[PDB]
């Protein structure tokens, strides 16, 4: 005869399952390769726990996703050991400002840094923020793909990148789309890119470019993207869903995302284009990550 | 001096309580007879845990209530060993469609099935879904009470039951209220019922019957209920509260239910009629199912 | 080419429709017989407007329904000329306290009062409030049906009615259900009722009666209703829907009510009993009051 | 005295009363009607039909997405619909009951509708059958959208069998309708054989990966994989962007004006957007 | 596999399992207990009593504001309460039923409670009578808060008649209790005659402007007009500040450390804040 | 017999009342002296209407309150004629940034400007914003009381004021509390104030002052307020209520505010202090304004 209400009863059964499997699941944890906490409010305490339990392990973490986690500077510092384990680090939509950039800077300067992909989009970094970040990028050798989409850089921000870029020698992809920047800033950076030793791709769409500004960019092999007309197209939609995840019919949003995943698999299967396959597989990555979060 | 916030502090106290009592409550679990998880979102993982901890035990589970649990087909399959333990199985309000009917079908066909009462109301089963369900019912001997209220059947659905019914020989009560069906379907089913070897009671209220349709049914001993206006009266009332529980004022609803519970006790004590009593005992169980769930 | 947004555009079309039809609908207004404003927040200004436009007219207002209107004492005073036109006056769910009882008192004492049915349920009137109300009732001859369900009366309140009742000579029905009262208060009132020259029906269900308390009442022709378990059955059901109307799924509730309405029609047509019919006619009016309000 | 909103209401009345003659003229010369998102009750319906039932111009666009429209409201709104070149009725919970009214709209001698968008309504196969009869006797409609309308197997086979009865249809969207390999194939076949049909959408159905290739390999153009416009059309229906909206046209226009043989496909993908922008 | 929250739950379990011995020690030496805002069901109550029913230290503060506590929960929590120096129970919907349990808490030989905050509970005059009996046999409580507890006329007169039965009460808050001129005056009188009572709060009652002057003109200090601390105490109960919170102490501390004869009143007004800051 | 649902029926009666009283109320409007639209979303269209109907009239508008109106730069420009009528203008909590400051600048430079009190608090003006505003203040002679509480000024912002202040010769009260500014900025401004020809009162509380910074300020007759320990105390509470108005129990919040108003009246009546009376009367102003808004 049951004394515990439904949710309290389930909590209780969880505890027992978790108690009985403690030794087995402890081993499983030390061998994790992926860590998705997108959409959970990472308070100081949760931050502390994640660093304690996962601050060390056998393998690198192929991916660490903390999109939309309401992360602050302090949480960042606490999570440093976990980030040092990461190859891909997603920190989008976390409200990070210049304060947090000092901590990222140190993460990038750290001898143990093995981050190849860093996504900092949809955080109000600021020009001040990026300047600080740039210094970390100056002494880093691991990072090949960096995203700064919609991070409040503006003119000042992009000119700073343009001037400083060549101090990093391994960066391959930089995304600076949607940052309120005008014609000359955009051009200075486009110029720096083409002169860069490693930089293969630069995103400049959704900035405040005039139509003549665009042509100049277009006419200027580091590849400059000035218009949305491919995986990036997708990124920005899925940015919206990630935003509104909590706000929508979960069961519906799940099926939109399942069909889109299926849809992506096949388009990937049925072209032989290397760069097409790579672009789709990227979108597969973002979609799987939203499903998980549901 | 306290470092954790209120809910975080309570979690921590829970863990310690649970840790200290582990041996004692592990024993309590193994001799459970009732399982109410109504209103909790039963994700794959919760499904997995419940199957693991409660998949086996001493006694049958006199009742298993998972109304309003956002259960999918997969979670169903996971939960099959728990369902095989159940005498009474509530799965209302779970968004189950035709997909989930195959799993129910197999549950009903399983040699170990000892389910007597199966409530599937407020799930979009469909005519397709009930066709599949019917096949399971064909090879079942345990189920005596089946509820299909508001399951999307329509004319196609009820005509199907009418044609297939006599393939089951132990069914006593069938609720097909509120299913969008018209006069002839309802009449074909009412006909099949009266010729059925076991079927004692069929519910047809809240369908799309014409006033002449209803008299025909009325004039037609399997008893046919065509109008709500006792145990089913309140069933639909409570079914309604069941949708909206956490979704509106808790304390107020708690008191309404306590007073209603009390009104029913007294009503039951003041009748000698074995039938009336039994009808009322049903409703108290439902009130108690909601009280607990609060 | 459209400049206004959707709702703003609709407002503008409304104005023009209203402007064109001004003379015609002004006439329609002057011969209204019914006034349902249930669910709208009746502020001082809305109160003022309604009094101004409808303070006078040809006919009596067969019914005035202002349930759930967040009405205060002042708005009451404002609305007095409209209330003097009313045969039936619904003021449930308006948060009326003792303050508002003086205004009701005066309404009941007014020479032009022709209110027959006054429903004050779900307002925290209080024993103090009912004392004041009672004085009005003492000098009234129009009111035959009075509802005080869940108005905070308690023992003090019901004892008051018991002592004062016979001062009114035309009252036929009194609902004092769900008022927190105990066995003796309920018994004193039930006693006063049976000795009352006119009082045909007293409701006492959902009070804090003991099971022995209830039998006593039951064993005690003024009819005393001690248990819910027909017209009052649903009253409390609907009273519940009435709280939560816009607050939850509209289309679903619309359909439930349409089907219920329909179930009641048919039930009424299928009984010859003049009493049953009348009970059911009451409930349809209430269903229709909710339908309209949607 | 007047609280803020009530005071604003009162100012509106007076502004509206002083400008009555002037704005009455403006209305009769309206060419667009967007009521997307307002709950169109019987009364609101009645008012719209009264005030806008007739006018000088055709209504270049009529948008009533997400208006909680019922069959009755539909009948009331018919004289307004008859004025419409483009008619949006997405997300209105329209079922088979409403399809009779649509049927009669399509069959009406005055029908001037070129684009009809019925997506995200539970039409059903029963509903589309009835709709198809209207389409059979229509000559105005060139673009029809049936995205996520509960058609399934039965529904798409119906279209495949009945389509060639219409001779002016250019674009048919039947994406996201729960349909499998054969139904999708039947309809893809019918499309290629169709005298007018230039584009068929079949993405987000229940196709197998071999189903897809067959479709792909099969000039009516069949779209089987969303992966060149319909991207938000599927998801934009879930919220029902504050900058992103215009920035796709601001982006696709500055890209429409920098290309030959496929300068057209940029335009009708800009138009699927230019829709949702104001829509 | 594990979704984000479920994965976090699992990490928590493991962190909690590894640290069990260590944090068990930490708990037994807790001195503060704040559960403000969590719905304390029977089970949660039971757990708290089990794990924290006994310990080394007194609990310098126990805060359970806004916890949806009932009478039963109260009884369950008694052994925890007995450990408390300061006990907050505001906003818990406590009525006369609960007052018996409070009464017994106050009468208990082990009662060490100095500050008891019962505001924004519908105690009632019936409730306060019962509470008063407990207060009669209590010696620990120096600060009692009855702000907005439905006392009225009847309630305050009761206090006035019964007060002198307690001899250690220093501060009584009966603000915002719907009481009129005479009740307020009776109680103000009783206070001035009281052996210990240093401060009585009477603001936000139903006093007339002449009532106020009489009170004003009448050393137990009677506060009749909120216009030197209780400012948010009245409104802070409505939300139940992200910077404003600390900035009042950050402001009142840097003002507590720049003054003599009334350096004390800055402190106990800082303490009414220093409460709500963590509370 | 009624055809219109409750809210639609009330709309209809409003229209008729408003139609019948058109001539009378038209006259009333032209003689308005006060305009409170606090808390309504002032869209372009509403802005347009308010300027049309109230762009001119007989009297000055003793007060114009548009707190919490979601006003943009464009709405501001549209509302310019109404603002030119105003003696006191409240524009708090409107999200105004540097963009809007050009429009305020022009409002202050306008020959017809008769604004004495301008409240711009809780808008992210910025140092850039204030610089622009300062220029308008340089050519204004009407404004005696200016509030810039929490407008994102910081160090840069306050130093700008300090340097520019003496260009205005009639300013009496400046509020720059809660603007993230440090010791020297605060001191420079305090210094400028004491040297100012007219400035009687300067608020500097809730800035980032060190305790030694405070003493220096304190030790430094223009009156400098460095700590909250009076009407200003209140302002900032009522700032919170105004914020959360829509979010709270309106009936409750109304009674808190009624009792506080009563409370204020009396404390004003029962001290003879001129400056005390003026401070309370200010709080009376803010409270009455919230009540109205309810
Ligand atoms: Pt943005
Ligand atoms: Pt759907
Ligand atoms: Pt186990
Ligand atoms: Pt109640
Ligand atoms: Pt009139
Ligand atoms: Pt339904
Ligand atoms: Pt702030
Ligand atoms: Pt209250």
Curated annotation (Swiss-Prot), chains A, B, C, F:
Subcellular location field: Mitochondrion outer membrane
Tissue expression: Ubiquitously expressed. Strongest expression in mammary gland, heart and muscle. Detected in HeLa, HEK293T, THP-1, HL-60, Raji and Jurkat cell lines (at protein level).
Region (Required for the repression of MAVS-induced interferon signaling): 1-294
Domain of life of the organism encoding this protein: Eukaryota
Residue stretches making up the LRRCT domain: 230-294
Placement of LRR repeats on the sequence: 29-52, 58-81, 83-111, 112-135, 145-168, 169-191, 192-211, 212-227
Family stated for the protein in its record: Belongs to the NLRP family.
UniProt domain LRRNT: residue ranges: 1-28
Record's protein name: NLR family member X1
Disulphide bond pairs: none
Chain's role: Participates in antiviral signaling. Acts as a negative regulator of MAVS-mediated antiviral responses, through the inhibition of the virus-induced RLH (RIG-like helicase)-MAVS interaction. Instead, promotes autophagy by interacting with TUFM and subsequently recruiting the autophagy-related proteins ATG5 and ATG12. Also regulates MAVS-dependent NLRP3 inflammasome activation to attenuate apoptosis. Has no inhibitory function on NF-kappa-B signaling pathway, but enhances NF-kappa-B and JUN N-terminal kinase dependent signaling through the production of reactive oxygen species.
Domain-related comment: The LRRCT domain mediates homodimerization and LRRNT mediates trimerization of the dimers.
Organism the protein comes from: Homo sapiens (Human)
Subunit comment: Homohexamer. Interacts with MAVS. Interacts with TUFM. (Microbial infection) Interacts with influenza A virus protein PB1-F2.
